[PDB]
Amino acid sequence: PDTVILDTSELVTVVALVKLHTDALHATRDEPVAFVLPGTAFRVSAGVAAEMTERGLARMQ
Structure with a gap:
């Protein structure tokens, strides 16, 4: 391949x-995210959240 983009909707x-x-x-x-609040x-x-929850800074609602 040559995309390297994990998108399964x-x-x-x-x-x-x-x-x-x-x-x-x-x-x-249609809303980009550059910074979130507590x-x-x-x-x-699905792949990003894995790191977020693993970081201990964000939790799955």
Whole structure:
């Protein structure tokens, strides 16, 4: 291949628990994400969320 893009139209809901700057672009909707706050629920890729929840800064709503 030559794309290296994991997109299965399966967005995951995740809300940040602490002031963290995440880079997630809405796939199903039209709203980019460059920075989230502790209490806001933002949707990200299935692979991205894996790192978010693993970082201990964000939790899946």
